[PDB]
């Protein structure tokens, strides 16, 4: 069974899944300390409920919120929004790119114990258990990031929950992450190399898929095309069109790796970890929010000739296989 | 009146005050996410209550917990420990040395609003209002630290609450901070230049004191000698600056922001904890001939004048 912020669900209940999302991108404790940065907590909840309900109308049944402790994960927020939108949310453990000292001073053994607490016992005092481990790296894996990857591998092996990654500031990092994961004996079928739609290097994508990794083509709506005079948008969202990202889905299908593909928007309903009012910039690029995948990318791939049951396999079957602990 | 984690108190209730302390040195949300790092939340509470009760029995009536959001300040922990030990605790706003992105991406105007929120409205959803602003800087003030210092001055100017600082990685640095504070129009009498016992340059400290800054001699037991640091108190008294001295331990009862089990190292060096100032430093100064009344001025009068909001 798969643990969600409302409790455990069966594989049949997962449905159409977005595998790389967030309710809010923040920092530990920040939403509780300065909710007015988001207007108010109540406003953020309203926005996320409206957005998740729109995604639900368009067919979404589950999202994976990959927010870690250091990205400000507030599981009580996740649960409130999941319940009011009536959309399943899987919560994450792990470490993103902004660990505070209390995290980045820890050893691999200590990190392993922290992840196991959040998966096996619960997050904070809530009893809500994580269903995925998120890890993020920078171009060249730092010593501390290698400790995070090894601890993630150890926690996945103990619990069966999967690991999802991404690399910042580099269009490729999967080969370096995969080498660490395999040195710990982790099966590639437990790992999603996230944000792989940041590159057009098909050789790199196919070789990872061929080893059994999941390929997260999961920032599809992120494009600053038309926002050239806004340098902060270009840096965060890139200069490649959503179509260019989506066609990587077609390319991996066409090479026989339909079962290795996971798709998402990498959206959120508030963000404080970047420049002020960046939420408004993202919203102006993609008014559809989390509904971008079902409403625009799916029809786009159908128009290019991909059969509907292959798309159903990518959006339903693959994420259920990935999330189910094994 | 002075805001504490149990509400406002009058100056006369403040009493003997330790001006630079912590209950827990951590990171935002960490005690809530991994209480087992400290054994348990219950174990940290019991340790802190015992330690504060020991300090109270040695004469302490108030501590200033200078822990900021990014040092893991948990005002509900502070309120629980304050009530159990019957020691007043003043909580802090500001920014320490480990701001997360949601803080260090912010402008001076945004940081000002955040500090004002914590002073004027309350911390998180608790209604507990900060009574001091803490700012930490490193050797050569960074552009971000300068924004923090200016936001601190602006919040102080709007509320009357004082500012305490310190420079990590150097034995001086007060002049850098003073220049920024004065450029904002902040009175030196609202500012304590903390960790000033880390230098032996007596002429540097005397010059700051003559400009009206408070001098925080507040890491005395971290000589790991403490007597030499404590003689700086007598030296500043002899220069005529008794009214400008604040003394403390810079102690805590748990710490996760450094190496694992550093708390055990600290406890082995200073088993007196927060009672080190009243049990060791005060008798040392009296034995060196400082009158009782001068010691009461430093430990009672100066902190109340500093903490009392003064616009
Ligand atoms: Cl992320
Ligand atoms: Cl501090």
Residue numbers in the entry:
A (entry chain B): 36 to 361
B (entry chain A): 36 to 259, 276 to 362
The authors write:
Phosphotriesterase (PTE), a binuclear Zn(II) metalloenzyme from Pseudomonas diminuta, has previously undergone directed evolution to change its activity from a phosphotriesterase to an esterase of 2-naphthyl hexanoate (2NH); the round 18 variant (PTE-R18) in this engineering pathway had an additional Zn(II)-binding site within the active site, indicating a loss of specificity for two divalent metals. PTE-R18 was generated from PTE by the mutations H254R, D233E, F306I, I274S, T172I, S269T, M138I, T199I, L272M, A80V, S111R, A204G, L130V, L271F, A49V, K77E, L140M and I313F. Given that PTE is naturally promiscuous for divalent metal coordination, combined with this additional loss of specificity for binding two cations, it was hypothesized that PTE-R18 could have the potential to bind unusual metals in its active site. Ln(III) ions were an interesting candidate, as their larger size compared with Zn(II) ions could result in mononuclear occupancy of the unusual ‘third’ binding site in PTE-R18.
The strong chelating agent 1,10-phenanthroline was used to remove the co-purified and tightly bound Zn(II) ions to permit lanthanide binding in the active site of PTE-R18. However, in the 9.5 keV structure an anomalous signal visible to 6σ was present in the active site; this signal was not present in the 13 keV structure above noise. The anomalous signal was suggested to be a result of the Cl K edge (2.8 keV) and thus was modelled as a chloride in both structures given the proximity to Lys169 and the abundance of NaCl in the sample from the purification buffers. However, in the apo structure Lys169 is decarboxylated and thus is capable of adopting two conformations. In both structures residues 260–275 of chain A were unable to be modelled due to a lack of electron density, whereas in chain B these residues were modelled into clear density. Previous directed evolution of wild-type PTE into PTE-R18 resulted in stabilization of loop 7, and loop 7 was able to be built into both chains A and B of Zn-PTE-R18 crystal structures. This suggests that the removal of Zn(II) resulted in increased mobility of loop 7, which was observed in chain A of the crystal structure, but loop 7 of chain B was rigidified by stabilizing crystal contacts and was able to be modelled.
